[PDB]
From Swiss-Prot, chain A:
GO terms for cellular component: nucleus; proteasome complex; proteasome core complex, alpha-subunit complex; proteasome storage granule. One of its GO terms (biological process) is proteasomal ubiquitin-independent protein catabolic process. It is found in: Cytoplasm; Nucleus. The 26S proteasome consists of a 20S proteasome core and two 19S regulatory subunits. The 20S proteasome core is composed of 28 subunits that are arranged in four stacked rings, resulting in a barrel-shaped structure. The two end rings are each formed by seven alpha subunits, and the two central rings are each formed by seven beta subunits. The catalytic chamber with the active sites is on the inside of the barrel. Present with 7060 molecules/cell in log phase SD medium. This is Proteasome subunit alpha type-2. InterPro entries: Ntn_hydrolases_N, Proteasome_alpha, Proteasome_alpha-type, Proteasome_asu_N, Proteasome_sua/b. There is a cross-link at residue 108 (Glycyl lysine isopeptide (Lys-Gly) (interchain with G-Cter in ubiquitin)). Belongs to the peptidase T1A family. It comes from the Eukaryota. It comes from Saccharomyces cerevisiae (strain ATCC 204508 / S288c). CDD domains: proteasome_alpha_type_2. SMART domains: Proteasome_A_N.
Curated annotation (Swiss-Prot), chain B:
Present with 17100 molecules/cell in log phase SD medium. The modification Phosphothreonine is found at residue 47. The 26S proteasome consists of a 20S proteasome core and two 19S regulatory subunits. The 20S proteasome core is composed of 28 subunits that are arranged in four stacked rings, resulting in a barrel-shaped structure. The two end rings are each formed by seven alpha subunits, and the two central rings are each formed by seven beta subunits. The catalytic chamber with the active sites is on the inside of the barrel. SUPFAM superfamilies: N-terminal nucleophile aminohydrolases (Ntn hydrolases). CDD domains: proteasome_alpha_type_5 (cd03753). One of its GO terms (biological process) is proteasome-mediated ubiquitin-dependent protein catabolic process. It holds the Pfam family Proteasome_A_N. Keywords: Cytoplasm, Nucleus, Phosphoprotein, Proteasome. This is Proteasome subunit alpha type-5. It comes from Saccharomyces cerevisiae (strain ATCC 204508 / S288c) (Baker's yeast). InterPro entries: Ntn_hydrolases_N, Proteasome_alpha, Proteasome_alpha-type, Proteasome_alpha_type_5, Proteasome_asu_N, Proteasome_sua/b. GO terms for cellular component: nucleus; proteasome complex; proteasome core complex, alpha-subunit complex; proteasome storage granule.
Curated annotation (Swiss-Prot), chain D:
The keyword Signal does not apply. This is Proteasome subunit alpha type-6. SMART domains: Proteasome_A_N. It is found in: Cytoplasm; Nucleus. The keyword Phosphoprotein applies. Transmembrane segments: none annotated. GO terms for cellular component: nucleus; proteasome complex; proteasome core complex, alpha-subunit complex; proteasome storage granule. It comes from Saccharomyces cerevisiae (strain ATCC 204508 / S288c).
UniProtKB/Swiss-Prot annotation, chain I:
It comes from the Eukaryota. The alpha and beta forms are probably products of the same gene with different post-translational modifications. Present with 12000 molecules/cell in log phase SD medium. Belongs to the peptidase T1A family. The proteasome degrades poly-ubiquitinated proteins in the cytoplasm and in the nucleus. It is essential for the regulated turnover of proteins and for the removal of misfolded proteins. The proteasome is a multicatalytic proteinase complex that is characterized by its ability to cleave peptides with Arg, Phe, Tyr, Leu, and Glu adjacent to the leaving group at neutral or slightly basic pH. It has an ATP-dependent proteolytic activity. Signal peptide: none annotated. The 26S proteasome consists of a 20S proteasome core and two 19S regulatory subunits. The 20S proteasome core is composed of 28 subunits that are arranged in four stacked rings, resulting in a barrel-shaped structure. The two end rings are each formed by seven alpha subunits, and the two central rings are each formed by seven beta subunits. The catalytic chamber with the active sites is on the inside of the barrel. One of its GO terms (molecular function) is mRNA binding. It is found in: Cytoplasm; Nucleus. The lineage of its organism: Eukaryota, Fungi, Dikarya, Ascomycota, Saccharomycotina. This is Probable proteasome subunit alpha type-7. Keywords: Acetylation, Cytoplasm, Nucleus, Proteasome.
């Protein structure tokens, strides 16, 4: 027994490529399209709920996850890899920040934490890189709104808007046309829905699409009252109904 | 690839066999055991004239009653010598006496097969066998003078005389005819000095060759160059004598 | 290079063959199973095949009682199935000890899925060639069906099927629900749900069953149990007096 | 074939064989012959010692494990030292803790189990030596044959090593005869030397070449070499 | 609290003659004011012509003797049945005792 | 965790990883050391694959292990640092426990041991380095010069060289160094050293550095000029014929 | 405890340390030098528990010398003292703490000013014109508080110390067998072999 | 066993070279170019952002210039994620030194430590090396302004001017051509931009594709100041130097 | 491609684990052994090939007991068999120590099952070269089991493995049909003796020694005991008679 794989499984080829990272990226390419758009007063991340069977209950499988009350994530690639990455991210936000400073980490730092976790699966002994790319959107007092992308290599970069997965090239192009630095959150949501339509083959409604936003504080989602400085989470997943209402004005 | 402790289809351990090959490439070492002491000689074999010959140490002391010669990857012998010195000294501390030559040898040979990448038997942390054979000579009350050949295989044989290194097959054949149960220490000396000269590439002189012995009376001693040079002259004369 | 097919590292196409071949192993038993949700119960049917006459039929099962409330049916080799069952039980017991309440079906599923995801990423662990279908009547979610595969993937189902002739059972069930328009078998007694279950098993597989050709597990409020050859026979008789 | 399934003990060949184990067994055959036989009162070990040169000694092949037990080796000497040392500890343990002498049959089981561990895990190697264990315990005289595969068998007599088959057939023949050599060690030993010489070919057993050991009823396991074995040549 | 030690009484005497030596000891074993045995040997023959006795706390005295006898056994195993000279046995015992320098064998030993 | 046997024997009795370690030494810049009657000189050549360096800060080739002992080398630079550090640490430990600084042979035997050890430990490759160690034993005036190599073997030399084209320069030394009359002067010893390097440096005033070590921790490195002066006086020795 | 005194004058730091080593009923030595040179311009005096005292001093010495070789540079007095404070502050919470108090006197060649540091076994560090450990301060601080001047010459420092030692030899119950005095300045460390009657 | 899948990242080639190091260096040669130029009154670090988009947020971006200390910064060429791992440990080492000696860490000591860490992945552990090369720009009171460079092998050297990443040969030749010992920060800033400008594999050299930093000792103060230029600041200096 | 059969935990393209299958070959190459469940117990029997007249008769016992109520016999690599029983013994001691009651046969079976299944999860170990038939009496009845190198096991009415497993299985199936009411321990012992004799034909070349053991609520009080003396000979005869 005992993991005797104490050597790297990702190494440099004569060309200078890191095979496993490349292959991991290829896996990301085959994944369902997902995207994020930053507005002046919020951020929107969305993807398609590619139900693997009509007997499956798509709601019981969220591709859009809340990491902190002001940060959310979405991805393209291997779903199981994403799931564990979210668990690890939620925990690291606590262990490496909330338990030390008494507050949630700012988007760039949590992103940086996730990236580190991914970089290690690229060098540690006996493992393969994560087969996913994440798009993390959040907000924090001193940085405002932000959107980041994290790839299998562990690299991450800030975006105004971008897409990953299957039709990323097409979608990125369509986004470059409609994005400006004066978009309001609703505008971004609209643009997001349009972009996502071009990537969807079949049904396109609030039950096939998953979309969340980082926006104003939702005091109604706090669960308690009595502490002035606590106003509620900025992260909010839209409801099936809320999406359809916006699809009519498509 | 292949495990470092794998058996060949013939029932031998590759690494140990390949180890014996490196030993064949080492400088010659010879030992003769007589009822008057045991002689141990080696071929310095410096690689350049600028190399100070006396800094070549292929004959070392284990304890006052035990010394040894080495042949092969000499750097691999340091930890072996250390273990030996420690073993003999430790034995003295625990039993207020000298460690028997056989026991000291058996201790050294115990390190031998302690190699591998995780062999189920203890914690043999050593990547490869030693690449050097040793001639261990000494004296003790129970079995008098003794000569042992310790190999990286972990086995050690007792000999009346023995040669290891590049000129071993040749030198050993010589020893086969020259050795007899009544050799005197002086005879063994010349005899070792002679065989070395036959198998050595260079012309044997007191600078590229070194002698030593161990006697019950004075223990292990390494002959200084002046002492050997004379013994060399004495050999040339007895040879030219017929 | 060609070893990207022995351990779980990516292939130039971003694939994990070992996980794929593990999926292959799940059909090795040539057994089909299906699960459906009742109004307040959850049923799981699985073919039972005992070839050797020297075997004690009573000890041949692919259904397991994981906890007082959770049942699990396994599609795949028995040894890997039993390895998954033990782990699930240990996990279910510990959860109760640490958090003070019974582990929910979906959570147990996620936990097993994550453990699988790991064999998918660490090179020294091989995946288990099995598909796990968890069922129960969750105190918060109601009748529940959650299934996990060698890829570490999992999701909840209105109903589901697994095995060589999975596709046929699936389309059969899909059709029924397109028709009924509801996401469950609108029956008050689990007995009738078990009957619906077995009935569609037959229609889809085009085969008749005796009392020893099936294996049934039922999950109700605060309890999950498996039926006996006789409890089944009573079921087979009832469906007979309708056709 | 073989070449692809003999790189380590952790691999089964397509036919269910373990080549590394088999290659180990080969080391035994290349080892000098040794014989073992017992009556109802004694057990004897006769072993042919092999020498390197005519200037070298004849490597010892018999090891005493306790006052009532001992063995003979054929193959890698170092591995016999390890295994016999382990047998010495096990006998010692039985005495110190239970004030009981270790049963020869129990020793056999312990050797089998130690050898087996080295044939199922990555990294190790099988032991490359065969052993013949003799001893007198609470159930009389005993003789055991140990193979690196981990297989240990109790017999009336046997031999292992090069040309061992000679002595083995001789004993399988002389059976009814020596099994009754009770109360007469010298007769048992001579019968042992007669079985061992059935595997000679090269030379003839000499004084510094023959090695014998005996144990029994009122005889603590003792080893005879040289002059002491002269009266048997 | 638990006291790991006890006193079993007894007395032993060792005298060295010119070419002989004796080691004697009473055979009474006690605990406080009670006699545990009127005959419990305390001086032992340890092989190689060496007799020893560890008087004081019997459990410790027994362990020591038992440990030394086993030492003689291995001495033979490791040094080709060489005889353990009494001077060597002495140094050996010193190490056996000093090994428990911080939780001593509560005995006065004589060989 | 990683303990793969990287340095093992091959059928012909060789240990390729150690052998290849030597190849890395051949590739390194040349180094030479010659002992006079009252000093030891260490010369090293400076590469020129790239030139625009800051000589003040760029790591020098000759390192002090203690105040009376220096170490130069040929091979992987990154590897030499590991040895130098361990040697410097062992130098202080020795002074701390024996209350006396290390002899040159001792310090050398230490470095060599570390090297030998890396040739038969799992999970590690041998050092791609060879070293020249020189200095004066405490309270002694007799010069010492030793050399070590990947295998772990070591010995003393009257003069020796390592690195690329060491074959060439060694020849120069073998037919230019008389043990009967070693460079009786710091000056003539430094000259012989510069001469040996010129056989391979090909006009390199800024490509040749020298360090002089005298008894009692007296160690100093020459400046470009001081050296350049030696080169000049040497090119004339040739032209004047 | 022993006598450990230090005074920082205009261009040097002077350290005075008792020569007696008493073990119970007897004075085993009257020529003990309770100091270690850490680097050419830094000296450390020490007093405390029997064995710990020298072991600590030598341990510190080793580390500074190693740093000097590795960097071919001499750490500033302030740097060497922070290193030492940290070593003691670690020890204070270990299994068996070093019971040693030290005075570190050094001449900062970069700043061209002498510096005196006082650090007790807890890792308490302070920089002062003059300082001491143990009871010594109790008898001497009133004399130093009175006569001390920042511009004193080394000669004036030695006179002020002599005064301190005399007060100590008058009111202190123990015979510390005189002191060994050392000066640390821009030119290094030297010992005043003549204080037995200066 | 596992041996079968071990790439053996730490062995020698028959020529005595380290495969992995060599291949990692090859990887680095495709990374955006980074330049380091040391003047008499300061140091200049400039780097070219590899790959960019209209949507990439540049104000919040940093992929090549990192602050290690208040007196030391590095320019990165290679795997960003690998660089970040090393940068963080470099930052910790700096603080350990500070806490121990109560003095900022001398520039070389920090560089040698980071390089030693790299050297490790080269001799033991069986792991791939870091696909990173650093240009260190820092200041201390023993050597003043210093410029260093460290690569996957664990080797480091000092420079008056240097580059890492793509087209270093072209960049080095251009620098060795116009560099002068008595340069001034402003001069160096200009040289740096000109060098990148001629080695870019891109059309033009715009601000959105650059990162810039300078370590000067602001005359009106007496202390050292690091300045990581902001988008707009780069855009400005880009016009002034005549590249618009 | 190929090579899927060189490492132990590898799935071949068709979802198999070749090393486990090659392990089976080692089992089929072994001596035949069986087990028979009776109305209140179980009987075990095995073929012991007499390599030569030198083997002391009755001495080399093969059947092993676990705790005091369980019997185990196997075919294949004997040493692997012992290894498994040793674990079984620790497994049983542990269970009794915590729960007081001796371990139930079903529970004991899974203990052996999980352990064997475990040796098919890594390439650092080899599968077991034995199939094991074991069982005994517990709180509710008798139980017979057979465990394959894959870790697979089921409860049986009768079971056999090794060289003559087919003959044996054949004979066993006959008994199953001709005795729906249940065989008695006394009868099963004889029947067993026969089945070994018959199945010995697939190895009729070498002479052998018969070995039987049983655990019957009525005949042995639920304790595993070896069949010796009279009861043994009586069964040997019953066989020798129906072998002609």
């Amino acid at each position: 027994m005992t993991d005797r794989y104490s050597f790297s499984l990702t190494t440099f080829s004569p060309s200078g490529k890191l095979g496993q990272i490349d292959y991991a990226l290829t896996a990301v390419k085959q994944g369902v399209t997902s995207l994020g758009i930053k507005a002046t007063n919020g951020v929107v991340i969305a993807t398609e709920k590619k139900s693997s069977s009509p007997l499956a209950m798509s709601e019981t499988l969220s591709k859009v996850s809340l990491l902190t009350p002001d940060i959310g994530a979405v991805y393209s690639g291997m779903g199981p890899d994403y799931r564990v990455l979210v668990d690890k991210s939620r925990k690291v936000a606590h262990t490496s920040y909330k338990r030390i400073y008494g507050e949630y980490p700012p988007t760039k730092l949590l992103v940086s934490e996730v990236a580190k976790i991914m970089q290690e699966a690229t060098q540690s002994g006996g493992v393969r890189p994560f087969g996913v790319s994440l798009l993390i959107a959040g907000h924090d007092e001193f940085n405002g709104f932000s959107l980041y992308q994290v790839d299998p290599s562990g690299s991450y970069f800030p975006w105004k808007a971008t897409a990953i997965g299957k039709g990323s090239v097409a979608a990125k192009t369509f986004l470059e046309k409609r994005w400006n630095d004066e978009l309001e959150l609703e505008d971004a949501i609209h643009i997001a829905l349009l972009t996502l339509k071009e990537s969807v083959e079949g049904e396109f409604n609030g039950d096939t699409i998953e979309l969340a936003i980082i926006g104003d504080e939702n005091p109604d989602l706090l669960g308690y009252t009595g502490i002035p400085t606590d106003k509620g989470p900025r992260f909010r997943k839209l409801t099936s109904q809320e999406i359809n209402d916006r699809l009519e004005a498509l | 690839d292949r495990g470092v402790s794998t058996f060949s289809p013939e029932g031998r351990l590759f690494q140990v066999e390949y180890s014996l090959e490196a030993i064949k490439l080492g400088s010659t070492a010879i030992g003769i055991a007589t009822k008057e002491g045991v002689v141990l000689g080696v071929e310095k074999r410096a690689t350049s004239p600028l190399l100070e010959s006396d800094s070549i140490e292929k004959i070392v002391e284990i304890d006052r009653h035990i010394g040894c010669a080495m042949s092969g990857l000499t750097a691999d012998a340091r930890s072996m010598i250390e273990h030996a010195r420690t073993a003999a000294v430790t034995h003295n501390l625990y039993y207020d006496e000298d460690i028997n030559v056989e026991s000291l040898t058996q201790s050294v040979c115990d390190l031998a097969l302690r190699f591998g990448e995780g062999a189920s038997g203890e914690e043999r942390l050593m990547s490869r066998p030693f690449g050097v054979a040793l001639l261990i000579a000494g004296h003790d009350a129970d079995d008098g003078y003794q000569l042992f050949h310790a190999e990286p295989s972990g086995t050690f044989y007792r000999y009346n005389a023995k040669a290891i290194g590049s000129g071993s097959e040749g030198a050993q054949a010589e020893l086969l005819n020259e050795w007899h149960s009544s050799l005197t220490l002086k005879e063994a000396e010349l005899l070792v000095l002679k065989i070395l000269k036959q198998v050595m590439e260079e012309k044997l002189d007191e600078n590229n060759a070194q002698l030593s012995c161990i006697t019950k009376q004075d223990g292990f001693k390494i002959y200084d160059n002046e002492k050997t040079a004379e013994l060399i002259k004495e050999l040339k004369e007895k040879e030219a004598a017929e | 290079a060609g070893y990207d097919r022995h351990i779980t590292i990516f292939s130039p196409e971003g694939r994990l063959y070992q996980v794929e071949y593990a999926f292959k192993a799940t059909n090795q038993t040539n057994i089909n199973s299906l699960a459906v949700r009742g109004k307040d119960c959850t049923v799981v049917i699985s073919q039972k095949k005992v070839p050797d006459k020297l075997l004690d039929p009573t000890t041949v099962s692919y259904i397991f009682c994981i906890s007082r409330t959770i049942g699990m049916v396994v599609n795949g080799p028995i040894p890997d199935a039993r390895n998954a069952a033990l782990r699930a039980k240990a996990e279910a017991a510990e959860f109760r000890y640490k958090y003070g309440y019974d582990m929910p079906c979906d959570v147990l599923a996620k936990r097993m899925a994550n453990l699988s995801q790991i064999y998918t990423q660490r090179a020294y662990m091989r995946p288990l060639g099995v598909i796990l279908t968890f069922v129960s009547v969750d105190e918060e979610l109601g009748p529940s069906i959650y299934k996990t595969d060698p890829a570490g993937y999992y999701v909840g189902y209105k109903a589901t099927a697994t095995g060589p002739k999975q596709q046929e059972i699936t389309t059969n069930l899909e059709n029924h629900f397109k028709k009924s328009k509801i996401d469950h078998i609108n029956e008050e007694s689990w007995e009738k749900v078990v009957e619906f279950a077995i009935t569609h098993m037959i229609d889809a597989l085009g085969t008749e069953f005796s009392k020893n050709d099936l294996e049934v597990g039922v999950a109700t409020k605060d309890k999950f149990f498996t039926l006996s050859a006789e409890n089944i026979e009573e079921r087979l008789v009832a469906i007979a007096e309708q056709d | 074939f073989r070449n692809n399934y003999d790189g380590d003990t952790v691999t089964f060949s397509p036919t269910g064989r373990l080549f590394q184990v088999e290659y180990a067994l080969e080391a035994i055959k290349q080892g000098s012959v040794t014989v073992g036989l017992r009556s109802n009162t004694h057990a004897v070990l006769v072993a042919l010692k092999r020498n390197a040169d005519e200037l070298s000694s004849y490597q010892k092949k018999i090891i005493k494990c306790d006052e009532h037990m001992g063995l003979s080796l054929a193959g890698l000497a170092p591995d016999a030292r390890v295994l016999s040392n382990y047998l010495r500890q096990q006998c010692n343990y039985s005495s110190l803790v239970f004030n009981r002498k270790l049963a020869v049959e129990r020793a056999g089981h312990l050797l089998c189990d130690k050898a087996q561990k080295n044939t199922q895990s990555y990294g190790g190697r099988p032991y490359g030596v065969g052993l013949l264990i003799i001893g007198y315990d609470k159930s009389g005289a005993h003789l055991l044959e140990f193979q690196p595969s981990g297989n240990v068998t109790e017999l009336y007599g046997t031999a292992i090593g090069a040309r061992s088959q000679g002595a083995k057939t001789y004993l399988e023949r002389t059976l009814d005869t020596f099994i009754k050599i009770d109360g007469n060690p010298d007769e048992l030993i001579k019968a042992g030397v007669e079985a061992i010489s059935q595997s000679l070919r090269d030379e003839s057993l000499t004084v510094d070449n023959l090695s014998i050991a005996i144990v029994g009823k009122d005889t603590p396991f003792t080893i005879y070499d040289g002059e002491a074995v002269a009266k048997y040549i | 609290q638990f006291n790991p030690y006890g006193d079993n009484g007894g007395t032993i005497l060792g005298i060295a003659g010119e070419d002989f030596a004796v080691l004697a000891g009473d055979t009474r074993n006690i605990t406080d004011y009670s006699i545990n045995s009127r005959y419990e040997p305390k001086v032992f023959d340890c092989g190689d012509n060496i007799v020893m006795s560890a008087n004081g706390f019997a459990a410790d005295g027994d362990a020591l003797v038992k440990r030394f006898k086993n030492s003689v056994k291995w001495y033979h195993f490791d040094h080709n049945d060489k005889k353990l000279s009494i001077n060597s046995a002495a140094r050996n015992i010193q190490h056996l005792l000093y090994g428990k320098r911080f939780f001593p064998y509560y005995v006065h030993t004589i060989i | 965790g990683y303990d793969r046997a990287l340095s093992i024997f091959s059928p012909d009795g060789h240990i390729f990883q150690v052998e290849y370690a030597l190849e890395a030494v051949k590739r390194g810049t040349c180094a030479v050391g010659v002992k006079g009657k009252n000093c030891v000189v260490l010369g090293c050549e400076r590469r020129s694959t790239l030139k625009l360096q800051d000589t003040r800060i760029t790591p020098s080739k000759v390192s002090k292990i203690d105040s009376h002992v220096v170490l130069s080398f040929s091979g992987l630079n990154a590897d030499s640092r590991i040895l130098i550090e361990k040697a410097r640490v062992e130098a202080q430990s020795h002074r701390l426990t024996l209350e006396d600084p290390v002899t040159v042979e001792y310090l050398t035997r230490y470095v060599a041991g570390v090297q030998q050890r890396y040739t038969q430990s799992g999970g590690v490759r041998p050092f791609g380095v060879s070293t020249l160690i020189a200095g004066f034993d405490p309270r002694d005036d007799e010069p010492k010069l030793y050399q070590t190599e990947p295998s772990g073997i070591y010995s003393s030399w009257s003069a020796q060289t390592i690195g690329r084209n060491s074959k060439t320069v060694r020849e120069f030394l073998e037919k230019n160094y008389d043990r009967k009359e070693p460079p009786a002067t710091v000056e003539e010893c430094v000259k012989l050293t510069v001469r040996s390097l010129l056989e391979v440096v090909q006009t390199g005033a800024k490509n040749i550095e020298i360090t002089v070590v005298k008894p009692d921790s007296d160690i100093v490195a020459l400046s470009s000029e001081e050296i350049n002066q030696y080169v000049t006086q040497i090119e004339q020795e040739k032209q004047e014929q | 405890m022993d006598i450990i005194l230090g005074i920082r004058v205009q261009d040097s730091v002077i350290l005075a340390s008792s020569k007696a080593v008493t073990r119970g009923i007897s004075v085993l030595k009257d020529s003990d030098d309770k100091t270690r040179q850490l680097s050419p311009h830094t000296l450390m005096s020490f007093a405390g528990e029997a064995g710990d005292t020298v072991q600590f001093a030598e341990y510190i010495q080793a580390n500074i010398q190693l740093y000097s070789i590795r960097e071919d540079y001499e750490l500033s007095p302030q740097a060497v003292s922070s290193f030492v404070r940290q070593e003691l502050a670690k020890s204070i919470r270990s299994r068996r703490p070093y019971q040693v108090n030290v005075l570190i006197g050094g001449y900062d060649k970069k700043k061209n000013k002498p510096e005196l540091y006082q650090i007790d076994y807890l890792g308490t560090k302070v920089e002062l014109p003059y300082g001491a450990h143990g009871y010594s301060g109790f008898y001497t601080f009133s004399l130093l508080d009175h006569h001390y001047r920042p511009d004193m010459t080394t000669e004036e420092g030695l006179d002020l110390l002599k005064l301190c030692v005399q007060e100590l030899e008058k009111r202190m119950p123990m015979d510390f067998k005189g002191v060994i005095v050392k000066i640390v300045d821009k030119d290094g460390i030297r010992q005043v072999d003549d204080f037995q009657a200066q | 066993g596992s041996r079968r899948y071990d790439s053996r990242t730490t062995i020698f080639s028959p020529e005595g070279r380290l495969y992995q190091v060599e291949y990692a260096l090859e990887s680095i040669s495709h990374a955006g170019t980074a330049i380091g130029i040391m003047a008499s009154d300061g140091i200049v670090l400039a780097a070219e952002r590899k790959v960019t988009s209209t949507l990439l947020e540049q104000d919040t971006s940093t992929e090549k210039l990192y602050k290690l200390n208040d007196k030391i910064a590095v320019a990165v060429a290679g795997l960003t994620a690998d660089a970040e791992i090393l940068i963080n440990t470099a930052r910790i080492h700096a603080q350990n030194y500070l806490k121990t000696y109560n003095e900022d860490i001398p520039v070389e000591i920090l560089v040698r430590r980071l390089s030693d860490i790299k050297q490790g992945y080269t001799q033991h552990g069986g792991l791939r090396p870091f696909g990173v090369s650093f240009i260190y720009a820092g200041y201390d009171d023993r050597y003043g302004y210093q410029l260093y460079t460290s690569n996957p092998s664990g080797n480091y050297t000092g420079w008056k001017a240097i580059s890492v990443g793509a087209n270093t040969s072209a960049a080095q030749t251009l620098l060795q051509m116009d560099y002068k010992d008595d340069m001034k920060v402003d001069d160096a800033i200009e040289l740096a931009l000109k060098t990148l400008s001629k080695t870019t594999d891109s059309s033009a050299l715009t601000y959105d594709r650059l990162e810039f930093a300078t370590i000067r000792k602001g005359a009106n103060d007496g202390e050292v100041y690091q300045k990581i230029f902001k988008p707009q600041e780069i855009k400005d200096i880009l016009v002034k130097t005549g590249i618009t | 491609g190929t090579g899927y059969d060189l490492s132990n935990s590898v799935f071949s393209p068709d979802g198999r684990n070749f090393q486990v299958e090659y392990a089976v070959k080692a089992v089929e190459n072994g001596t035949t052994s069986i087990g028979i469940k009776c109305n209140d117990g179980v009987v075990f029997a095995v073929e012991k090939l007499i390599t030569s007249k030198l083997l002391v008769p009755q001495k080399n016992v093969k059947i092993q007991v676990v705790d005091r109520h369980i019997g185990c016999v196997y075919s294949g690599l004997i040493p692997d068999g012992r290894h498994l029983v040793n674990r079984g013994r620790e497994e049983a001691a542990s269970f009794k120590k915590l729960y007081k009651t001796p371990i139930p046969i079903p529970a004991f079976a899974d203990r052996l099952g999980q352990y064997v299944q475990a040796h098919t999860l890594y390439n650092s170990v080899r599968p077991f070269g034995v199939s094991t038939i074991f069982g005994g009496v517990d709180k509710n009845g008798a139980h017979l089991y057979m465990l394959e190198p894959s870790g697979s096991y089921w409860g049986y009415k009768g079971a056999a493995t090794g060289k003559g497993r087919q003959s044996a299985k054949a004979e066993l199936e006959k008994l199953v049909d001709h005795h729906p009411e249940g065989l008695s321990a006394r009868e099963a012992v004889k029947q067993a003796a026969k089945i070994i004799y018959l199945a010995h034909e697939d190895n009729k070349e070498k002479d052998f020694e018969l070995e039987i053991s049983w655990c019957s609520l009525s005949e042995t009080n639920g304790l595993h005991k070896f069949v010796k003396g009279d009861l043994l000979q009586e069964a040997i005869d019953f066989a020798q008679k129906e072998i002609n």
